[PDB]
Design a binder for this molecule. Structure first.
Ligand SMILES: [Mg+2]
Length: 600
């Protein structure tokens, strides 16, 4: 029998509906306690940090419980006088680089049937020429009816679709994973029988341990992907068949003593590989910063065979230099790229990129964090993006995120691990091939009530620009978009008009779910944008952005950093409600059913 201590997992189902990159997850688990005693049951799964929980329901023999979303402050008032912290008590916590762990332990009645259902949503982001859907599969028992169903609907059409299950042998995956796509519709169905779940023909344990990955991309022949539905729009921009731009890239590398060991080795290895794949038309230099600041050439040099080999030799040879002069290192790298303005104007049409890697905070020279931010942004002056890589967890990552945000870039975390070299290569490949610069998506001011970031410094091959917004009443029919940008010595310009007939056709094919997901796509991107914006503004404007993010989280019912989801009707030993939160970037209690709470 599958059951353990009288408890068996009758069914465990993951249902993912993807509509124009908006991914709607529903995970449903039904556990049955056949024992005549009380038994403890678990609902335990991993979800991506990028997603927002939107609903949670528990039904025990008709007794229904639902997560009520509210201001986080209100939800955590029960923790103030309590012996446990909300972080320790919460059902959700960080469990890895990109995933969070949702865990609840519940004492169920005898002869009981309990159904758990968790809903979470995200907008899939394109990277490396694909979208990726990752589902952590790990039932701590065999499941009678296990299913993963992914239903994809893309107006532009699906160009490719794949489904990989690492934990399954190639022969088992073939018979068990059903996938197909035609036109706008794609489907993946994974329905392993109990026999197919056992690791061995006559062993009790289940091989369903690992990750179920679904990847796809949409046809990009049609340069215009403007999707309008019920006063909300989503605009996807990723032109194909563009010529790679030549680029000027400077690497600013921390060589402080703390880098000693694996970090410097993995950093050097990544630089060697990056230099090895550089294209002849690019220009580059290298900057090292410890206590002293050091540049390989002091100016942008061409990526010739000799220069690349000399740079690789310089990478292999350098040694560490104690402290960390981050201000000097960045300003030096910026000075080199800015030579293109006066000394080297023949490189001015290239796309410029500045990448910085550090494992610690500034200890030499300018150490006032606010001053460094000022120094950097005043030197770059919006000419090129800055990509900060935080190596390990001794860096002030918020400091790195703000700096990149203030300079048309983003920050990325590098985890100290056996694959740090691949992480660095992985990130660089996202910015390695600029195709357009100064992308300006323009929409008629008379029609737009709200909109997301519409200016983007660089567009890279393999990635994508997405804009969403809300349309004013009676302006949807004539809605349009103009996209301007520059290539290397070229001007880019297109116009996208709503295809009214096509929208109605799409609405018929996908149903009213299309309207809802486009709006919720806008809400998701707007909330994320508010969370990003709030971190780089003064405390007064930060409160204003927070209130916008709070109100939108409540309106659309998202569990975000400003909201929590509480479950009335359950209590731990101290009478505390289950609480669900969004953990931040920086002892397992068990619950019982309790219908009473002290009256106010
Ligand atoms: Mg350091």
């Amino acid at each position: 029998d599958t059951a353990v201590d009288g408890v068996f997992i009758r069914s465990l189902k993951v249902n993912c509906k993807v509509t124009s990159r908006f991914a709607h997850y529903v995970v449903t688990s039904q556990v049955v306690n056949t024992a005549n005693e009380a038994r403890e049951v678990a609902f335990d799964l991993e979800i991506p940090k990028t997603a927002f929980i939107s609903d949670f329901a528990v039904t025990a023999d008709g007794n229904a419980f639902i997560g009520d979303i509210k201001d986080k402050v209100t939800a955590w008032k029960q923790y103030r006088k309590a012996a446990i912290s909300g972080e320790n008590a919460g059902l959700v916590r960080a469990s890895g680089r990109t995933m969070e762990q949702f865990t609840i332990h519940l004492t169920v009645n005898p002869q009981s049937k309990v159904t758990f259902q968790l809903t979470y949503e995200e907008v899939l982001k394109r990277n490396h020429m694909q979208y990726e859907i990752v589902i952590k599969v790990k039932p701590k028992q065999l499941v009678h009816h296990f299913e993963i169903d992914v239903d994809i609907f893309e107006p532009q059409g699906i160009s490719k679709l794949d489904a990989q299950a690492s934990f399954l042998p190639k022969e088992l995956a073939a018979q068990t994973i059903k996938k197909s796509f035609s036109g706008k519709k794609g489907h993946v169905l994974f329905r392993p029988t109990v026999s197919q779940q056992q690791s061995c023909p006559t062993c009790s344990t289940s091989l369903l341990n690992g990750h179920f990955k679904v990847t796809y991309d949409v046809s990009r022949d049609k340069i215009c992907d403007l999707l309008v539905a019920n006063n909300h729009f989503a605009h996807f921009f990723a032109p194909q068949n563009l010529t790679n731009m030549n680029k000027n890239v400077v690497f600013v590398i921390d060589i402080s003593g703390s880098m000693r060991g694996q970090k410097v080795k993995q950093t050097k290895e990544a630089l060697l590989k990056i230099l090895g794949d550089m294209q002849p038309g690019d220009y580059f230099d290298l900057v090292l910063f410890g206590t002293r600041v050091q540049s390989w050439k002091g100016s942008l040099v061409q990526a010739s065979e000799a220069n690349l080999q000399a740079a690789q030799d310089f990478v292999r040879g350098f040694s560490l230099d104690e402290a960390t002069n981050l201000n000097g290192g960045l300003l030096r790298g910026i000075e080199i790229l800015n030579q293109v303005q006066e000394s080297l104007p023949e490189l001015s049409n290239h796309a410029s990129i500045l990448i910085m890697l550090t494992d610690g905070d500034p200890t030499e020279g300018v150490t006032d964090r606010s001053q460094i931010l000022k120094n950097v942004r005043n030197a770059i002056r919006g000419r090129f993006p800055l990509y900060n890589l935080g190596f390990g967890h001794n860096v002030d990552f918020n400091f790195l995120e703000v700096m990149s945000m203030e300079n048309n870039g983003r920050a990325q975390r590098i985890y100290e691990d056996h694959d740090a070299t691949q992480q660095l290569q992985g990130f660089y490949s996202q910015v390695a091939k600029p195709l357009l610069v100064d992308v300006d998506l323009q929409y008629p001011q008379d029609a737009v009530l709200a909109l997301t970031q519409n200016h983007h410094k660089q567009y890279y091959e393999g990635s994508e620009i997405v804009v969403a917004g809300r349309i004013a009443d009676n302006k949807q029919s004539s809605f349009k978009a103009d996209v301007q940008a520059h290539g290397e010595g070229q001007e880019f310009s297109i116009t996208c008009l709503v295809d009214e007939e096509e929208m109605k056709k799409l609405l018929r094919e996908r149903g009213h779910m299309l309207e809802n997901h486009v709006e919720r796509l806008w809400a998701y991107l707007t909330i994320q944008e508010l969370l990003a914006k709030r971190m780089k503004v003064d405390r007064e404007e930060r409160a204003n952005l927070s209130s916008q993010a709070l109100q939108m989280s409540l309106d659309y019912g998202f569990v975000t950093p400003l909201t929590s989801m509480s479950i009335r009707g359950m209590a731990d030993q101290d009478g505390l409600k289950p609480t669900i939160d969004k953990p931040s970037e920086d002892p397992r209690r068990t619950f019982v059913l309790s219908a009473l709470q002290p009256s106010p």
